[PDB]
C-alpha cells in the first residue's frame, strides 16, 4: 500500500507537509511554545500521531536551517512501526552557560526577537514558537532477520576486524 | 537470505534482542562498567560482532530513554558490511564542566545512585553498568552505484541549487 | 539505473571514493582549510554536487575516526533528491570554552600540529585542512506515500501509545 495514516491529537497540531516530489521527507511542526535556556533539555510535543507499517522505520530528524544557524541540537528519533503515541522532538540547547545576560531572545534562525516589554534573559536562550517548522520525518525500509549465534562467520571479508577509528589517511 | 550472524567475544557480552515484530531494531547492551565525567569521551565496547551482508548498513544509534533523560550523547555509527570486529558505542557525556562537586553519581536514567561508601564526584557524572541497555541497531538497505563525473546533470530539478539553510518559513 | 552523477564545482574539490565492495558509502573530503575555535559553528564546503534520483535520500554523516577522537560534531545532512547545489558539512567544535591558551592546534585526529612559526591559540581548537577526509555519504531508499488524516488507526498494535522514554529495563 501507498498510504500513511496521521492522527492530530489537538487543535495545536499541524499537518506534516511534503511539497515537491523531489523532497526527502515530511515537515514537522511544533505544537508548543517553549523557551530553552543554555544547556537545557526538553521533549517538544508535536501532538501528531503516525501509523508506520511493518518493514519501515521513521527518522524524526533535524533540518539544515535550524541546526546550522542555532545551537539547538535535535537527536534523531527512531520511530518504530506500531508506535501510535505523540511524536516528541528530542532537543537540547547546546549553547554554553557563560553566566551572561541579555535582553534579546533568539529565534530558530538565530535572529534577535524584539519585544515591547523588556525582560532579562540568559545569553544563548532560544524560543520555539507554536506552529514553527523545526523538524522533518524521513521514512526508510528496514531489514529485520532472525538472529543466529555463531563462533565464526561463514564469509570472511576483506575489511575484517578493521577498521574502527581511522583519521588522517 | 533472512539470517544475521552474531559472534559474542566475551562472557561479558549480551545477545541483542528484538522483542515484538513491531520493533525497528535490536537492543544493544554494554559489556563495560564505566564512569564518564562531564565532557569526557569514550568508546564503550559491546564485545559483540555482527556479519551484515552486502547491500545493507547497520545504524548503531541512541534510544529515546537514555538520550532524553541524560546528557549522554551517542554518535550514530555506520556499521559497514564485512566489519566483523567489536561494535563500539561512540559516546560523550555532554554535561558542562561547572567545577562543582557532589556525592551522587547519575545512572543512564538520570536517577541518583545511592552508595554505602561515600565518595566525591564531579557534578554531571554518569555511570554505565555492565549489561545495561543503552543503544540499538537498525539495519537499512543501501544504494551503492558507480560514480560518473559530469559537467552538467541530465535531469534539471525544480528544487535546484537551493535550498540550504532555510529557517522561519 | 545504477549510476550516480557527480559535479566538481572547483579545483579544490575532490572526487568521492568507494574503495572495497564491502564499504557502506562514499568518502567526502573538505575543500576548505578552516580553524574552528571551541564552541564555534561552520558549514564546510566540499565544492561537490550530486544528483540523487527520486526514491532515495543521501546521508551526509560522520566517520568513526574524526568523531571519536575529536570534539568535532557533524550533524547528519539529509541530501534530498534533486538538490544539485554544493554539499555542506554541518559542523560544530563542541569543546568547552575554558578560556585557556595553548601554542598547539589539534588536527582531525586530535594530534598536536607542530609549527615553525609560534602562535597562541585557544585550547580545544581544531584545524581542518583542504583535502582531508572528514565525512561520508550513505544513500538509502525512501518511502514517500500519500498522507491521510484519520481519527483512529486501522490496525491497533501491541506497542501502542507506549513507549517513549524507557531507561533501566
Ligand atoms: O525522538 C523521539 C524518539 C522516539 N520516539 C518514539 C518513537 C519510538 O517508537 C518510541 C520508543 O523509542 P526508543 O526508546 O525505541 O528509542 O518513542 C519519539 O517520538 N521521538
Ligand atoms: O560507532 C561506531 C562507528 C563505527 N564502528 C565500526 C563499524 C564500521 O564498519 C567501522 C568503520 O567506521 P567508519 O570509519 O567507516 O565510520 O567501525 C563502530 O563499531 N561503532
Ligand atoms: O548538512 C547538510 C544538510 C543539508 N544539505 C542540503 C541537502 C538538502 O537537500 C538541502 C536542504 O536541507 P534541509 O533544509 O531539508 O535539511 O540542503 C547539505 O548540503 N548539508
Ligand atoms: Ni542518523
Ligand atoms: Ni556541549
From TrEMBL, chains A, B, C:
Enzyme class label: hydrolase
Positions of the dUTPase-like domain: 12-97, 127-168
EC number: 3.6.1.23
Binding site for Mg(2+): 94
Keyword tags: Hydrolase, Metal-binding, Nucleotide metabolism
Pfam assignment, any one: dUTPase
GO biological process: dUMP biosynthetic process; dUTP catabolic process
MF-aspect GO terms: dUTP diphosphatase activity; magnesium ion binding
Domain of life of the organism encoding this protein: Viruses
Residues annotated as binding dUMP 2: 64, 88, 136
CDD domains: trimeric_dUTPase
Binding, dUMP 1: 64, 80, 88, 159, 164-165
InterPro entries the record matches: dUTPase, dUTPase-like, dUTPase-like_sf, dUTPase_trimeric
Similarity comment: Belongs to the dUTPase family.
PANTHER family per record: DEOXYURIDINE 5'-TRIPHOSPHATE NUCLEOTIDOHYDROLASE
Record's protein name: dUTP diphosphatase
Organism: Staphylococcus phage 80alpha
